[PDB]
Amino acid sequence: EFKRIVQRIKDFLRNLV
């Protein structure tokens, strides 16, 4: 996704894997 509150890339890989 990278579009669900991940725009800041704060997590990206920490949002699932």
List strand residue ranges (DSSP E) for the chain, in order.
none
Rounded-to-integer distance, Cα 11 and Cα 1, Å? 12
Handedness of CA 4, 10, 2, 12 (dihedral sign): negative
Rounded-to-integer distance, Cα 2 and Cα 8, Å? 9
- The CA distances from residue 4 to 10, 14, 17, in Å, are 11, 13, 15
DSSP-assigned letter for residue 1: -
Environment class of 11 (CB within 10 Å of its CB; exposed 0-12, middle 13-18, buried 19+): exposed
| Residue the block writes with tokens 């579009």 | 3
| Experimental technique | NMR
